[PDB]
Swiss-Prot record, chain A:
Keyword terms of this UniProt record: Cytoplasm, Nucleus, Phosphoprotein, Proteasome
UniProt subunit comment: The 26S proteasome consists of a 20S proteasome core and two 19S regulatory subunits. The 20S proteasome core is composed of 28 subunits that are arranged in four stacked rings, resulting in a barrel-shaped structure. The two end rings are each formed by seven alpha subunits, and the two central rings are each formed by seven beta subunits. The catalytic chamber with the active sites is on the inside of the barrel.
Pfam families: Proteasome (PF00227), Proteasome_A_N (PF10584)
Functional summary from the UniProt entry: The proteasome degrades poly-ubiquitinated proteins in the cytoplasm and in the nucleus. It is essential for the regulated turnover of proteins and for the removal of misfolded proteins. The proteasome is a multicatalytic proteinase complex that is characterized by its ability to cleave peptides with Arg, Phe, Tyr, Leu, and Glu adjacent to the leaving group at neutral or slightly basic pH. It has an ATP-dependent proteolytic activity.
Modified residue annotations for Phosphothreonine: 47
Result of altering residue 41 to D: In DOA5-1; slight decrease in activity
Gene: PUP2
Main location as per UniProt: cytoplasm
Protein name: Proteasome subunit alpha type-5
NCBIfam families cross-referenced by the UniProt entry: PRK03996.1
One cellular component (GO) term of this entry: proteasome complex
Organism annotation: Saccharomyces cerevisiae (strain ATCC 204508 / S288c) (Baker's yeast)
Family label: Belongs to the peptidase T1A family.
Curated annotation (Swiss-Prot), chain B:
Full protein stretch here: 332 to 625 of 993
Protein name: 26S proteasome regulatory subunit RPN1
PC repeat locations: 86-118, 119-156, 157-191, 192-232, 235-267
UniProt organism field: Saccharomyces cerevisiae (strain ATCC 204508 / S288c)
Similarity annotation: Belongs to the proteasome subunit S2 family.
Chain's role: Acts as a regulatory subunit of the 26S proteasome which is involved in the ATP-dependent degradation of ubiquitinated proteins.
Note, other: Present with 306000 molecules/cell in log phase SD medium.
From Swiss-Prot, chain C:
Family matches, as SUPFAM superfamilies: P-loop containing nucleoside triphosphate hydrolases
Record: residues binding ATP: 175-182
Name of the protein described by the UniProt record: 26S proteasome regulatory subunit 7 homolog
Record organism: Saccharomyces cerevisiae (strain ATCC 204508 / S288c)
Assembly and binders: Interacts with UBR1 and CIC1.
GO process annotations (BP): positive regulation of protein catabolic process; positive regulation of RNA polymerase II transcription preinitiation complex assembly; proteasome regulatory particle assembly; proteasome-mediated ubiquitin-dependent protein catabolic process; ubiquitin-dependent protein catabolic process
Length: 242, 294, 381
């Protein structure tokens, strides 16, 4: 066939390039870094009513001060998630403190290229890139709140807000207009949740979507269905004004 | 219109059905279900408004869009000539199959001109066209009042109106009106030329010994202006519609008619088709009319 | 039986009428002169050959005039060349009515072309294709360049000369073949009314040798005849691409058939006027000599954009169908991944049966959702 590390004729990595496909195949996941906090929300995307959306978490807590969400082939992240969480603990284990969200984030993206078959120059044992992308939200003393988009490319950026997964780009465009630094956690909740409901195939609810935040005071905090439902209903009220 | 009795019937009910009224406004249900689009535009110009006023009648034939005609009248007035009439008959086209469609028509039924007069004349024959008495109130029959004149465009579309009026409304009067006008035999004035054809549209499918004799009394006589193949034909095909009813006629009629050759002639070759209502699906279409092409 | 036979009775007499009729004007008109004029007229023309016992033409037999015979036979009887010095005949060299060189040229002109070609063009060309905007739906980015490659130079050749240039002289198309692909070529072909040569490489390799070579010439010949013409190849993969199968040794001519195509297209062919266009599945298969500039310049996918392109494309397609105006093509387009401006009909076109299964005029969302599912699942490819 063709090698896994094989560069595109443009110098790109097919598998990596293709890895980006399943990324878009991942549920649309969105978060907004505010000064107040970072709102997270994601697409439950239950494939069946018998499927209990409770057992669907693409939002995960790395640590109190740092957590992240996934969009892509999920269980790939488990290692990464387990990996990531370790590092902070490890960091804290060494440094008796929280890790810079970036420092953690940066560390994680180092997992990216570690796929290869007996790769030249190192031993990095994995067959393929990770099939998932990550919204990563953490509050750190230095950078306050931040939102980074982890990528199987090992590249990540800071984001005022970010939309990843299926309906990302459109939702992304939405974020472009909607976002401003002065957004409030609640607003961001509303914005995400709305733009979710926007991009969501199913009618948005607490069951077919999932919410959470990370707040310097409280660090990473999940939103339950009920608070969710309110915000939902709240939007429904606010969404219907004019 | 029958009765309520279970043999004749034609209740007070079928009146909206058998003669269609409401179903079309009903069809206008599914007609709006699956639909087409509105091409009408007030355009720039009477040359352009000529057709465009027709279109409200075109598109909305059998339909009430008449607001664009009702509320814009001069759209039909800027149409002038027999497009005046056209834009008026388009209103009757809009008002076809109405309880009363005289409304805009009687307005245009006369303004300044026979052509204008001609408008409703045709259009009112259109009001009840497809039936006789309209859908309720009298309009097609009243038209027979407006027909009366041996002048160009008045007769013209009244001839039109009363041809389509008197299909199923058939009357000797219009003949007895047009027959001497036919004897008067002037297309640009008496208009009787095309009248015979409207007269052909009156008694259709029936033996009228009068018209049997009447055009026998005109055509043979070659009344008034006739030199042209016009008053030849106009009268020729006039007889070809009204009868054409018989077992030996479907093939016997053409035997004596399209055999020779004149105005009244090459046309009626297929008029034996639109003749008898008994024994449809006839082949003589190509069967016979291969020959005259060969 | 009886009553039906009355209809049957009417059948007989009716037919007898025409029979009786047809005989009538038959007597009147009494057909030599439609031809016997033209016949005897062209009998002169006939005889105009028949002296000296005599647009492909193949062979002129203009025969046996010795003083003189003024003809070419390219044929196993008495092969002939009029030339060797200044050798003509005032209008026409001589006879057959055939007057001229056969095909194979001997001197010039001579009698204006008697020519040209045997096997017609075994290749066949539709000019002003049935596609102008037809599959042009969703196809923009490609055509955006195509128009440059094709349309504008056909439109205003001057600009490129005003610049000092030409259009891209050759262009590649790949992805699902001909899918709108050829038609899209046919599109701008009929958009510009240039001569669109659809020649498939399938036509090129046949039972014999110099096969497409012969063709490619005749192609390149009538290219210049049809100038401002689109030479279009679907299946560049038919002749194949770059290969060493000359190492096997049988492929050589097939390989050469390309090299044929390769060679001649290179030097003299105007590609600002005569358009050259290629369609494949695999651009990876190219003989680089194809990919050479001044042979292939522009290179383009067919292609398969985004959610958005599809919607329009969907929106484009479904206008054929009676379609529910509430449901959004955006809705549908969200679901499907990127796929072909052909396949996107499976979106619409399949739903018609959905629409008929659901017995709708206007297919519902799920009707397409299912179709999206149904079709895409039904792929498993």
């Amino acid at each position: 066939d063709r090698g896994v590390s094989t560069f595109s004729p443009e110098g790109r990595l097919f598998q990596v390039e293709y890895s980006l496909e399943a990324i878009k195949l991942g549920s649309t996941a969105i978060g907004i870094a505010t000064k107040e906090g970072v709102v997270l929300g994601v697409e439950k995307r239950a494939t069946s009513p018998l499927l209990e959306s409770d057992s669907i978490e693409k939002i995960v807590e790395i640590d109190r001060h740092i957590g992240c969400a996934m969009s892509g082939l999920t269980a790939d992240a488990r290692s990464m998630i387990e990996h990531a969480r370790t590092a902070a603990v490890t960091h804290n284990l060494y440094y008796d403190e929280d890790i810079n969200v970036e420092s953690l984030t940066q560390s994680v993206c180092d997992l990216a290229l570690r796929f290869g078959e007996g790769a030249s120059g190192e031993e990095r044992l994995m067959s393929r890139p990770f099939g998932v992308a990550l919204l990563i939200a953490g509050h750190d003393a230095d950078d306050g709140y931040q939102l980074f988009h982890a990528e199987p490319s090992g590249t990540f950026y800071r984001y005022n807000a970010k939309a990843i997964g299926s309906g990302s780009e459109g939702a992304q465009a939405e974020l472009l207009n909607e976002w401003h630094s002065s957004l409030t956690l609640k607003e961001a909740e509303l914005l995400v949740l709305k733009i979710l409901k926007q991009v969501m195939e199913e009618k948005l609810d607490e069951n077919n979507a999932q919410l959470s935040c990370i707040t310097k005071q409280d660090g990473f905090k999940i939103y339950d269905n009920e608070k969710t439902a309110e915000l939902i209903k709240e939007l429904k009220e606010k969404e219907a004004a004019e | 219109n029958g009765k309520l009795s279970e043999h004749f019937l034609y209740l007070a009910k079928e009146l909206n059905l058998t003669g269609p009224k409401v179903p079309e406004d009903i069809y206008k249900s599914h007609l709006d279900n699956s639909k087409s689009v509105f091409s009408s535009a007030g355009l720039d110009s009477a040359q352009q408004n000529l057709a465009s006023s027709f279109v409200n009648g075109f598109l909305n034939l059998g339909y009430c869009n008449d607001k664009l005609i009702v509320d814009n009248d001069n759209w039909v007035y800027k149409t002038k000539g027999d497009g005046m009439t056209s834009a008026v008959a388009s209103i009757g086209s809009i008002y076809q199959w109405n309880l009363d469609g005289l409304q805009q028509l009687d307005k245009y039924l006369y303004v300044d001109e026979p052509e204008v007069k001609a408008g409703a004349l045709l259009g009112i024959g259109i009001s009840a066209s497809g039936v006789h008495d309209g859908e309720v109130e009298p309009a097609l029959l009243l038209l027979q009042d407006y027909v009366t004149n041996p002048d160009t465009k008045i007769s013209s579309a009244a001839i039109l109106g009363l041809g389509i009026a008197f299909a199923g409304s058939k009357n000797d009067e219009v003949l007895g009106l047009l027959l001497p006008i036919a004897a008067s035999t002037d297309l640009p004035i008496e208009t009787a030329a095309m009248a015979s054809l409207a007269l052909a549209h009156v008694f259709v499918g029936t033996c009228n010994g009068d018209i049997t004799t009447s055009i026998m009394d005109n055509f043979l006589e070659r009344t008034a202006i006739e030199l042209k193949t016009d008053w030849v034909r106009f009268l020729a095909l006039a007889l070809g519609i009204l009868y054409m009813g018989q077992g030996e006629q479907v093939d016997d009629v053409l035997e004596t008619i399209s055999a020779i050759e004149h105005p009244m002639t090459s046309a009626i070759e297929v008029l034996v088709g639109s003749c008898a209502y008994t024994g449809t699906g006839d082949v003589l279409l190509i069967q016979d009319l291969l020959h005259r092409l060969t | 039986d009886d009553k039906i036979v009355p209809l049957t009775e009417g059948d007989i007499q009716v037919l007898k009428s025409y029979g009786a009729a047809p005989y009538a004007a038959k007597l009147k008109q009494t057909n030599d002169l439609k031809d016997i004029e033209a016949r005897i007229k062209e009998k002169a023309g006939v005889k105009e050959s028949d002296t000296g016992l005599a647009h492909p033409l193949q062979v002129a037999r203009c025969t046996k005039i010795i003083k003189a015979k003024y003809v070419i036979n390219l044929k196993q009887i008495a092969k002939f060349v009029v030339g060797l010095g200044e050798r003509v005949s005032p209008t026409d060299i001589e006879e057959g009515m055939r007057v001229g060189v056969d095909r194979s040229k001997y001197n010039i002109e001579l009698p204006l072309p008697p020519r040209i070609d045997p096997s017609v063009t075994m290749m066949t060309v539709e000019e002003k294709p049935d596609v102008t905007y037809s599959d042009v739906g969703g196809c923009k980015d490609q055509i955006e360049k195509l128009r440059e490659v094709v349309e504008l130079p056909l439109l205003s050749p001057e600009r490129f000369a005003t610049l000092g240039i030409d259009p891209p002289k050759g262009i590649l198309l790949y992805g699902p073949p001909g899918t709108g692909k050829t038609l899209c070529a046919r599109a701008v072909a009929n958009r510009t009314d240039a001569t669109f040569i659809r020649v498939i490489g399938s036509e090129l390799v046949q039972k014999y040798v110099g096969e497409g070579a012969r063709m490619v010439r005749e192609l390149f010949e009538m290219a210049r005849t049809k100038k401002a013409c689109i030479i279009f190849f679907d299946e560049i993969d038919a002749v194949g691409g770059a290969r060493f199968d000359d190492g096997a040794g049988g492929d050589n001519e097939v390989q050469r058939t390309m090299l044929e195509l390769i060679t001649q297209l290179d030097g003299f062919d105007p590609r600002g006027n005569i358009k050259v266009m290629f369609a494949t599945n695999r651009p990876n298969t190219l003989d680089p000599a194809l990919l050479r500039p001044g042979r292939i310049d522009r290179k383009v996918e067919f292609s398969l954009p985004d959610l958005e392109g599809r919607a329009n494309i969907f929106r484009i397609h479904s206008k054929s169908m009676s379609v529910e105006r509430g449901i959004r093509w955006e809705l549908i387009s969200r679901l499907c991944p990127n796929s072909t401006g052909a396949e996107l009909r499976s979106v619409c076109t399949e739903a018609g049966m959905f629409a008929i299964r659901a017995r709708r005029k206007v297919a519902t969302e799920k009707d397409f959702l299912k179709a999206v599912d149904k079709v895409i699942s039904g792929y498993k490819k």
